[PDB]
Amino acid sequence: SQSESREDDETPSCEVEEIGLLGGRYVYPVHEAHKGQIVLIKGISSAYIKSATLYSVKSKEDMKQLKFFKPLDYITEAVFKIVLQPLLPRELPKLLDALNKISKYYPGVIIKVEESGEHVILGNGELYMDCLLYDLRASYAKIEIKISDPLTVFSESCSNSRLGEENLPGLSISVAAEPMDSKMIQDLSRNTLGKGQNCLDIDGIMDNPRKLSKILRTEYG
Amino acid sequence: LYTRYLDRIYMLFHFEEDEGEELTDEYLAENPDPNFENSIGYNNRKCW
């Protein structure tokens, strides 16, 4: 997400304590890892939650060239909503820790914190969330907790003028709000490079506006 | 309203937020509770 953003202050670092090669139920000890292979690292965990890009650069131009890995695009959106509270409020700190651990281990989980101190958990579906809760109560926290009634995240919208005033009345804003074409909506939902004959994804906006506008004119009139 | 029957006291209090928010806040300042633990040790009437 930092990368999304793209010298001193920029770089945190962790030494690599060990490298092992996965073998299901055992890990084979490794002195060194080489390009191509996938390995288990000890101690690089703290820097990142979910995805991260690891580089070592000895070069100022080399550093400038270097491009950070894009955030992994998970196939589904969580949607399912659980509200948590611990059984006994005094044990909150343990719950908090555990929730962070769950975020690290389960890439599809979102933990949000409400005003109330309630924890909103999003997961993909029933079974998914059930497994989270089991591990949470058993493997990580040792705390019995209250769980709510399964809900869902809602989204806001409309279907069809403005007047507005600054707190120090010098500015005045009028903005129209409009229903969008289902085609357009679908095109936006589909993450794409605009390859083949495919309607260009708006995140390609950094390309010339003429091109962007060409797509809009071409596909929508 | 106030009464006392031997030991036990009964007091009725009427607040408005103006007066209400004050009394809440002063207690909070002098007994800060970040974990929301006020309601651990609070006694309901079991009966109802």
How many Cα neighbours within 13 Å face the side chain of A84? 24
Amino acid at B32: P
Q: Are A129 and A82 in contact (CB under 8 A)?
A: yes
Question: Which chain B residues contact residue A88 at CB under 8 A?
Answer: 40
Give the resolution value in Å: 3.8
Which residues, 6+ apart, have CB-to-CB distance to A173 below 8 Å? A162, A164
Nearest-Cα distance to chain A for B46, in Å, is: 19
Check CB contact under 8 Å for A92 and B40.
Answer: no
Number of Cβ within 10 Å of residue A39's Cβ equals 15
Three-state secondary structure along chain B? Answer: CEEEECCEEEECCCCCHHHHHHHHHHHHHHCCCCCCCCCCCCCCCCCC
Check CB contact under 8 Å for B37 and A117.
Answer: no
Which residues, 6+ apart, have CB-to-CB distance to A30 below 8 Å? A18, A19, A20, A21, A39
What is the distance between the terminal CA atoms of chain A, rounded to a whole angstrom?
Answer: 35
Q: Which helix or strand (DSSP H or E) is residue A40 part of?
A: strand A40-42
Q: Which residues pair with A28 in a beta bridge?
A: A21
Q: Which helix or strand (DSSP H or E) is residue A2 part of?
A: helix A2-5
Q: Which technique was the structure solved with, according to the deposited record?
A: cryo-EM
Nearest residue in chain A measured CA to CA from B36: A89
Check CB contact under 8 Å for B36 and A89.
Answer: yes
- The helix/strand/coil state of A57 is coil
